[PDB]
């Protein structure tokens, strides 16, 4: 801090770590566990049935109302069947006329793990 008494912590990454202070004479210790955010997001729909050409627009609502610099690295398993883009909205535009695409979100600024949404073609 400005007086050197306080210390502002910033857990940028993840994992357990210790933060020291008071370099003068005796130095104390204080553990700072960088536990994962695990802000579980939820897709608007999971069991969706897309059609040829038409792509039902989906969304990825996070557990909290908003996150600091929140963004989604949207991925689409079997990209030929369908693809998604954006962070909040998905836009699962289909290409193939049959298949199952496991469209799962991926929070770039947070935990990678996120809920998936299988887009059926029947």
């Amino acid at each position: 801090n400005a007086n050197s008494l306080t210390a502002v912590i910033t857990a940028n990454g993840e994992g357990n770590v210790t933060i020291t202070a008071d370099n003068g004479t005796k130095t104390a210790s204080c553990e700072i566990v960088s536990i994962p955010q695990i802000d579980s997001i939820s897709l608007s729909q999971s069991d969706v049935t897309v059609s040829r050409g038409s792509q039902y627009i989906l969304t990825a609502t996070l557990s909290p109302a908003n996150a600091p610099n929140q963004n989604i690295t949207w991925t689409s398993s079997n990209p030929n069947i369908a693809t998604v883009s954006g962070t909040s909205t998905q836009g699962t535009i289909n290409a193939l006329l049959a298949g199952f695409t496991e469209i799962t979100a991926t929070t770039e600024e947070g935990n990678r793990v996120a809920v998936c949404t299988v887009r059926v073609d029947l």
Partner: protein, 105 residues
């Protein structure tokens, strides 16, 4: 504190309720229209919505328009399936809270 330490009451230990998810996949089920065979006899009385077949009879005067030879197979797509596994038990109850030796030299 104590001479020997461990992670039992407050620490990052192991053991928990297993949870997992399976990516969406397409399952194909083929409903073959053949091998149904024939049951019952000539009507008589026949139930509604019965699939009509042919007896391979030589029509003396009429034309058997309901009998034909298949040329290509029929391919169908089945619906979705299971999602993932359910909760499972982790660890043994009688061995629960087992002591771990951690005394130092």
């Amino acid at each position: 504190a104590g001479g020997t330490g461990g992670r039992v009451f407050n620490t990052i230990r192991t053991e928990n309720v297993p949870l997992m998810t399976v990516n969406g996949s397409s399952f194909s089920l083929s409903s073959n229209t053949h091998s149904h065979n024939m049951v019952f006899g000539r009507g008589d009385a026949s139930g509604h919505n019965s699939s009509p077949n042919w007896y391979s009879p030589g029509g003396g005067y009429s034309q058997r328009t309901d009998n034909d030879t298949h040329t290509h197979t029929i391919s169908g797509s089945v619906s979705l399936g299971r999602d993932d596994i359910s909760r499972q038990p982790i660890n043994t109850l009688p061995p629960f809270r087992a002591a771990h030796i951690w005394r130092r030299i």
